Symmetry: D4
């Protein structure tokens, strides 16, 4: 494929970067593993392709790609499908590796995360650790309160996540103000536990 070729060419550049900066062998291996998991040996100009489409098609694509995730989350499954679409269109796919701190306690929070596939651990001084998996979200509390992160969140497995920025969160909720309650209920219940 032209896409397998693009991936190979891009990763060759990554190897040249890593050698230029004399990254240790095991570090280069970690980066290689990331690239394989994130891109699965194929690359295309996604922003370019999607930008060449129109609104309806982009919305149809994002709804199709996220079918299963949507159905597994009462947040979305039960919602106005236009709210679901507005949310989906703002999501950014990210992949984390085992051990990664996705969120660090006490920092400024600018994103939340929806778990497509993976296991993460929520870590608080007053433990023990609490796990979240497919169909859950986290990082909402800072977005709601503008306070610092209430816990750290560490990937236990390779985790395929979708992030939503605080600005995009606030934009969607300007259009669908009553959907704020869904996030607040989860946040309140979590704050009560910790």
């Amino acid at each position: 494929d032209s896409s397998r070729r693009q991936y190979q060419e891009k990763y060759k550049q990554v190897e040249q970067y890593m050698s230029f900066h004399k990254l240790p062998a095991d570090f280069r291996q970690k980066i290689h593993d990331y690239y394989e998991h994130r891109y699965q040996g194929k690359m295309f100009d996604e922003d370019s392709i999607l930008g060449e489409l129109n609104g309806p098609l982009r919305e149809e694509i994002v709804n199709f790609n996220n079918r299963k995730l949507v159905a597994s989350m009462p947040l979305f499954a039960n919602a106005d499908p236009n709210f679901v679409t507005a949310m989906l269109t703002k999501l950014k796919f990210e992949v984390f590796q085992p051990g990664d701190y996705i969120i660090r306690e006490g920092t400024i929070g600018k994103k939340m995360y929806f778990i497509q596939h993976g296991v993460v651990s929520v870590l608080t001084k007053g433990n023990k650790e609490m796990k979240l998996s497919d169909g859950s979200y986290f990082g909402e509390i800072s977005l709601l309160t503008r306070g610092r992160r209430t816990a750290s969140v560490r990937a236990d497995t390779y985790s395929r996540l979708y992030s939503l920025s605080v600005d995009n969160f606030n934009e969607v909720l300007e259009e669908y103000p009553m959907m704020r309650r869904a996030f607040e209920t989860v946040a309140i219940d979590r704050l009560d536990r910790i």
Copy 2:
């Protein structure tokens, strides 16, 4: 002396109404309002409270509004610091029977807590009544949309109003308390 202050202030009202040649029934309506709102006594509340400190102002506003606070779970079951923050922002208002407190379709700049009285919520279908210990006008404040209904006083109504700016300021400090308002709004929108 606050009786004298009232009588002096009302004499100025009378001279205004005379200058502008308001008809007798209207002047009587204004007289009745003044009696219900001020109860024959007036003082410069702003200057008085401004002479005090934060703790005393807060103690006073809590004492004055004990019934309001105990009347709604919103306040009764909340962080007392949230309650105090809200109370300090409330403005007392009296409405007369027939008054349109809120008009459907307009921009919403305030919500209202009912201390005593009965109002009718009017939508284009039967009127829905609200009374002591309820609030209304919250939906515009939450959504920034236009008023979803008219609200008309059925009886003399003693209300406390809260401006949209003050609502947002308090909820900046107490963000999770937004949920209490949203629950009421969602239930009402469904209905």
Copy 3:
């Protein structure tokens, strides 16, 4: 007593004019203005209306301005809530013969509704007269451009002014009412 309030307030004016050694003709001009503007009676209108509630303030402003409202299709044929929103924002002003109410080329911060009087619109060619039931100063408010003409009082003129900020605020609530002003502005610009 509002007669006494007037006479006391005017005595303070007299002491100001004396301190600053204004010439006799100028002092007479100020005296005549005071008589026309206040008609021998004064009261703290702001404090009075501030003691009332929204409904009564709105009832009063509508009653006081019945003639103005009926005099122009702008108000006469509009949503009465738009009319009330506009009226609440109006400031009463009296001008004397020869007064330049608006100067060509300056920044426009207000428009004016004529309750009673005659003004001349002056462009660099014959003067165009406007009288009871007309308005002017709208073009700057619409365009943010400089004044297209001077406007000078021919007679004692009783006007209501509306600030650019208030104009924009009302039209935020009533966006389609902008068209009424634009139609007048376009016709005048063509002429």
Copy 4:
């Protein structure tokens, strides 16, 4: 042509995207049809080409390309030609397919649309449906009032549209404030009907 080649290369990437995400056959067909209608088998870097020009030439091009559309609309035909130019320069070409919801009732409106070629249906709860075609525009009401969309608008045919953002609408009308009346008159007449 170098432009036919560019289109072919770009569409190959689109096929690789669609296969990667396992899009259904009929969905891939819909996307293929869109690409053919939107680009007509040719691609170039339009933003790059136009960006290499100067102001006068860009304005001459946009006026030429839109000759017929302009003449068919009393909005433009009767206007200051500098207003026409200012408007034209802000327009974004979009193509919609039969059945597409271009506008959904009740949502936040951030664009209006001018119809170059196509038929659309305006749909309100209090129907019946009203059709608009070449030389008409829609979506103006939200732009004027900042209220939510008063109706849905669905493409009945392949529709070649030019969108104008609310920011660009407001910018042009800052320069030509009296032209706001043209949009208001249409909006008022439509609000009276619905």
Copy 5:
């Protein structure tokens, strides 16, 4: 005469407390506050200082606060223009024993300089006392974070408060003086 002004102002307080039916102990608490805060004399300080010029206002605020200034290195060892800028912004406040001047976890809008009195800093562990010549409430102003502790008056306490906006304004002119506050904040956060 300022004794007469005090007695008149306090009579208005009494009429307020009577209207709102405050209990006797509360009325006594308010009486005691008034005596400590105003010491039997009242004047319109704002109007008085507003009648003066900048130099005289600055001379007065420096003279009135000599003890405060000499009591802390922050002021004692600083650019006298910084000291004057700060002093002009301070608001005098009196608190009574038991008053929560600052509540932990709330939004911080002010800091406080102790002229005379003792307060307890309370954290969830033994109380830490602060007295004449110390300040508190600085940490929220620096960080924009919530209050790290409660601060409660142990004695009648005569404080000067400085708003967050005024704090930031002064430090815009005197940016390096931020370090003095930061040093105190860091030491306290470590503890």
Copy 6:
């Protein structure tokens, strides 16, 4: 009666100075200021001018400031509408010998026009004197930089001040008048 108003206002000053135990020499300094600033007469100028209309306020401010206007080409040779815009924004201030009107290195928030008096411009070298018909403090307003010099009153000095916000507002309407200030600033910076 404005003599009575002065004497009443000054009695309140005396009670303030007594409460705060200002020393005799300082009280005398304040007394002398009051006499020079108000000349034994006081009235509520703000309320008085607020009772008038735009034309009369403008006529009054022009009449009161004829000498200032004729004394500087800045005003004397300018669009009279610019002159009026500036005058309406000026605040009268009196300074005493030795007063530091401007301190070098501080943030500049005002400039000053000399009606009557002598000031010294002080730079770290010989003092440069300015008198009737000159202005100073313009450089900070133009550049947003810190004050380039100190300016100290040598005699009792009757000045009009213009705030940086008001300066910028007027120059928004009259942009080419900025050049008059810049020419003075450039000449002074060179020197």
Copy 7:
């Protein structure tokens, strides 16, 4: 050269654009002439090249390229050379063709222009026309006053100009506030004439 090749490849794209939009023969000729004058048969990624440099080198380059223009203008020749550098760094090269309206009277003005090489005519209702040439600038008045353009300015010859945006004009003058007087003196003298 790689630069002659890049130009040829880019212009081929321009021809494909022009044929796609069926531009008239004489219009295509005008565009061809523009490209030859503007780029002189060579193209490179200038923003990329300059972006690869540092501050000092960019400043040395801009000062060198504009040596002659600077010396011919008392505005710059007499100024703080750091002011000259700050101004030069914000300038955008543009080329106009004979007959082009560079500025139209009555419009909102967002740029001024410095003439490197060319002749333009300033046109006012109260004429006659006034010519400006190498080393002059125009369009300053709107930038100073925020008023509408006081005249039209039309290129009489091929004109090689440098534009300066109102934002960039205001930025430079924040750093060098006393240099505002130079522009004001020219503006005042011109307003007096017209």
Copy 8:
């Protein structure tokens, strides 16, 4: 390498630029020397590569690349490692040549600089000159005070620097407000000396 090739291709473009603008021989030599020092004969799309990664990996890379610099500066060595990471992620690598004015006295300051490797001279009217080298920073004072530059700073050797913008400086210190004191202490001590 693909990276050596990219560098060669890019530098060929630079030569074509320099010849087009007829830059003097010694000037072209200075630019050549800069390119060799800055890029060391290799080029890749660094922003592209780093943008393809996730947060954790970018942070691991920046921490690794800057190991030695961090350890040599009590500012960082002693700090919350999350503060160090936040700072590092905002830094921009720049290379200056002997004689370059990195900062000019009296100008508006929008950046500060950390010295990775090089010697610079701080120059004040009230001299003499003061040198700073590896592990030092400069330009902090304008960032703290918003005043004009208090001195000029000139590179004595080839200097490998990391710049931090005023906006990025203020952003990091919003998250770590007490770290402002470290910069203030250095600034105060320097202002006392000059």
